[PDB]
Amino acid sequence: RIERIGAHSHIRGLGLDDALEPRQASQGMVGQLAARRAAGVVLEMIREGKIAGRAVLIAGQPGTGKTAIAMGMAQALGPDTPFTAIAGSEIFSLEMSKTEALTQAFRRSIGVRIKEETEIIEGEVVEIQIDRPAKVGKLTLKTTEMETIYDLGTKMIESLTKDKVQAGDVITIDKATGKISKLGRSFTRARDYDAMGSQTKFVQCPDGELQKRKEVVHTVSLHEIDVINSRTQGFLALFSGDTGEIKSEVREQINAKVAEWREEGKAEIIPGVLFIDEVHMLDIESFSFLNRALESDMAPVLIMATNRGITRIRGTSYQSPHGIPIDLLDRLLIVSTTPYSEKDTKQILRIRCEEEDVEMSEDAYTVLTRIGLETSLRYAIQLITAASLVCRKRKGTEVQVDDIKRVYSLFLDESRSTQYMKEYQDA
Amino acid sequence: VTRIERIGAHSHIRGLGLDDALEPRQASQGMVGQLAARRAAGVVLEMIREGKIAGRAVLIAGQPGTGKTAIAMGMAQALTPFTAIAGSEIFSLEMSKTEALTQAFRRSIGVRIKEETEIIEGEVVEIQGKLTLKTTEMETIYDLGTKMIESLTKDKVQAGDVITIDKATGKISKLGRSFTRARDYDAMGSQTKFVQCPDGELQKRKEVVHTVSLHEIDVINSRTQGFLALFSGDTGEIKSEVREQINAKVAEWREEGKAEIIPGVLFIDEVHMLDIESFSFLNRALESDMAPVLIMATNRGITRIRGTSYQSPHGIPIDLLDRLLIVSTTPYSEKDTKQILRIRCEEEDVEMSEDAYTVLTRIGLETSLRYAIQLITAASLVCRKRKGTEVQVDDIKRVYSLFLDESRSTQYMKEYQ
Amino acid sequence: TQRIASHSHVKGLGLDESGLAKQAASGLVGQENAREACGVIVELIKSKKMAGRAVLLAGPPGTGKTALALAIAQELGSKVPFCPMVGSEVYSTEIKKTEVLMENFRRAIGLRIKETKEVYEGEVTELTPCETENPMGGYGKTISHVIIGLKTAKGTKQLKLDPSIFESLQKERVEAGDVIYIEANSGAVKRQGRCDTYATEFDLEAEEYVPLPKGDVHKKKEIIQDVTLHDLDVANARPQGGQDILSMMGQLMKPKKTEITDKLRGEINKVVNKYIDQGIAELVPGVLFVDEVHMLDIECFTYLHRALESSIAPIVIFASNRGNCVIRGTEDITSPHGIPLDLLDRVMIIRTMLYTPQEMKQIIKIRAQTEGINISEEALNHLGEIGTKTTLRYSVQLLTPANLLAKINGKDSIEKEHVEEISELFYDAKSSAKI
Amino acid sequence: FEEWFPQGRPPKVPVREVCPVTHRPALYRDPVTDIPYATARAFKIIREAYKKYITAHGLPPTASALGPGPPPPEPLPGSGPRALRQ
Ligand SMILES: Nc1ncnc2c1ncn2[C@@H]1O[C@H](COP(=O)(O)OP(=O)(O)O)[C@@H](O)[C@H]1O
């Protein structure tokens, strides 16, 4: 519950209507109807997943809400669909090539819902009488509507001895493997032992004696390749990034078995999204790889964001729009974000204030909207926070003009920093 | 007999010859000239010895061959941990510049740790269930527990063995029997060497001081410690294990007196080759509490800083120059040159005539000083070839004609291959 | 060993109750607006309401940016963690730059985890009161309860524990006369060792005899452990327990610091939130002071202005010393403070003016005081004058050497002659530029 | 029932031995005389007393050493059950 509000916490989805009509202000967003409708339609395409290898480029001036609309789409997509957010400079690893990192990122945003039929027996253990030789045992499971006694085997008795199960424990035994899983207790333990005090759990299902076809959908991403590349996979799946596995017999074989599962009804493919923020940091080799990697059937939807116009492509000398080669730039379609006006700026500032739980006068809102239209929006939020803190220190109830104007001089913007920078501190 | 260390490039200086009041003499401990630089070296040496402050760096400037490295080696010999390195040593393939520089900084600091434990040692007479430990002045019987019984068997302890056992059931069989060696006429085991029977009280507490540098982070780095202490060791050196554990433990030992730190000196010869990254790291590293006294040497004036196209004095950033006390050296004169040549000849066991010394000083003034320092031994060997007892002008002239100097070498490069 | 560092006089921002700035601000002098901004941002940190916020301590060299940084750090107190980092440390040959930055961000975040355990200890006197066989079945011999006579230093208290634990008692060598470590819920018995009262001087053994427990048998030991999120990341990264990990050749290379985002985020964050909302731990976000930020590569800034966008990112205090300079890793791309113009928009710039000669004199005097050496009025005036001429940091470095020169010359206080002699024995770079 | 529950009596707290020559906490146990001791002088005196005893049937007198205020018993009857050295 203790998680602080970040720069994109004010947004909590992409405000859209039944007909995908964008709204002025909803779900923490304001203005920018065109790019928001583009986000809505690409999100509909993602949730459809019928087509693979689609790319979208979010372009615009800084502070136009590129990362904002990206996080909004991520939120609107909701759980059950992977959304791999990554920065352009994260692919540069000292233990795995750029192409390998891109393959990892692509396969990481693809999920397979594996269906598994289970048969679990549950109930209340009324009698767990076990005859230890130092071989024979019987279990008396009880439910709210029926009871049954089961003769326990040697291995089952040993498993029960492993996980201590006293009378009155709510357990869920899997008839397939016999794994002992304790859920709780139905009553106290004799009220006499001067220890082991806990709370009592609710009774089990009436038909819990034998659940026939308990369906559990195990969801896992296509990053499962780490499970095969090495005999010990947890080390690679948890921390180790040195996963330069062999592409042959791993990628192709896993894809083939995933197709077999999809055809045989075991699992279903759920393509996610790969959001590369500041994609301009990718080397030209990474762009050349994305050009081809984006053509596979397992290719997720590649959302990218650029904050530049004509700029040199990293790893070469010639320039291209958005710092992306002409090929990949032409392949994808671009979503331009128009700057926000004064009203939109004021509304965004008000939404941020509401998020931060801070209140300020109308004149404060006006002067702060002015300052934000002049300097920037993020700087306006910084001033919101600073003025709220100055007001709290001042013992006031709401932020007045005298606090925003004070924190404006206390904290400087880059435009004024460079102005006072004429002291030639260093070069 | 020839040994590992012998007469070298900086062996003539036995130390930083100074008076009680830090008044540099003309030439006492082999070093001559550079009076102001010598007094600065003595001042910084007294500062190091005091250990009242931390994070102080001194830059030794001057033209090539002005005795900067000589003054540094003299201070080191007079100075007790000392770590001398070069700008290329910190550059490691498996360790980033920052990691290597931090390792050097921590290795430049010493730490003394006093250990006091109870010890029981004596000749074993017979075991069993119970031990019968004998010493020169007495003998005692001890009852053996399960752990002691297991240790008596995992290690083949037997009569006559001079055993040793402190607390924590840490038994040791340091060496074998005393008298029984007789019947072992022909062969004697590798580990079964013999020792004299101990004397005094059987159980005795011994206080020992362990001297280790602050670079012990490698010891607490991995599961195995002694292995990494010989070769490069670990390369990671996680910041946490370094600061949150070792520094706090050293502080607690200082508070309770278990340990005491002794800040040394870190001499980085030819610091001009360092990258801007190393300088930026030093800018902060010199601000830490357990920071040793740093010494540097550079022959560069207005030169480019490696890693960037910027130029600054001494080839290093201005950010660091504002943190160093520059001690510039002065080129030697005729008298100083002749005196250092005399000292070098006396140290190398070379005898030369007055005219020979005059010609050698004239050469060392027209050319570099190291050239004449080498001509000394060259003419000595020429005289030995001629079987003469003293080196004359003819020998030094023959050598000057045989071995060329930078100036004459460049002048004779007209061939251009 | 006091081991006075370079600048330790700073103890805090020293702001008045009203939040304004004063001269004697707990060691640090001058810099009114800068110290007020430091107070505002430290109040922010204490609020623990915002995350991923960065501040830039832009200012010419010698303005004491690191000084005020350590001041605000001390003001925060040892309670919240403070991880200092320099731009050079980001360059690692084994782990990528962005992952080092993320590890530093994690270190900057703290987390206090409490743990209360009810345990019973004391000399055991085992005895099983015979009870009629299970009344539900036939007859015979059974045991309905097992009484353990735990004896502590304060007294004795018999515990009628559950009979099923009898297996644990027989498992370990729990004989009458030893100290056992009982657990309330688990019940597992862990023998500490025999009582020292039976440790006869003639018995040779160690780690087997332990003193009697002091206090009541029932002890509710409350312990708190503060570990940063990076500590938990590292702990959950590497394995432990069998699995042939004892190998030396193929395993001694412990520096596998490489880390993935799935483990870093996700499960660890969820378990942290579970411990927080359950009452087992309390999150403590700290601060990440990054000096020499201009030394970072553009590949580092492009990841910084994305990590700062996360809700979990802690407060970052950047301190750039350079001015308009080409960004590292870029082809002649000049930007203010050596930082891309895109990141400067996300940081609050706290400008620091140059110290007034009077402030220079105050700094020199307080540094001399901290060092513990008296300086005469004339010597202090000369030190202030030379600090006005050249960089100020040169003067403070002339105190200890001048102090030693004075002590060796037979005098106690630093006379003007001593500083005058040291200024000729040692000088600054501005004068050394005369090649 | 007996195996899993060896109901044995308490460990019978041992005796706090004392050096008979100096009356201090005994730190050692002489092997030949089987009497505790704490110092080298005590060991020498104990060895001398044992030699005097084994010389004849039984030493009529008793060796005295470090007699405190109260009458020291000069303990001869501190029987050493151990036999001859070898
Ligand atoms: N539509 C919007 N609604 C609310 N805040 C916005 C919007 N657009 C931009 N911002 C704010 O501007 C700052 C930077 O803009 P961002 O959302 O990152 O877009 P960009 O990626 O173009 O900078 C952020 O702090 C963000 O909160």
Ligand SMILES: Nc1ncnc2c1ncn2[C@@H]1O[C@H](COP(=O)(O)OP(=O)(O)O)[C@@H](O)[C@H]1O
């Ligand atoms: N004052 C001096 N006393 C003794 N030897 C000196 C003195 N000055 C220079 N030398 C000799 O000069 C030689 C080379 O000088 P060097 O230390 O390389 O100069 P730099 O300090 O510029 O590196 C050394 O072998 C050293 O013996």
Ligand SMILES: Nc1ncnc2c1ncn2[C@@H]1O[C@H](COP(=O)(O)OP(=O)(O)O)[C@@H](O)[C@H]1O
């Ligand atoms: N206001 C001040 N009061 C006292 N000492 C100061 C002050 N400002 C700077 N200093 C001194 O300046 C020295 C270093 O300052 P620092 O924080 O490193 O600035 P920079 O990093 O820009 O060089 C410190 O040793 C400190 O003693």
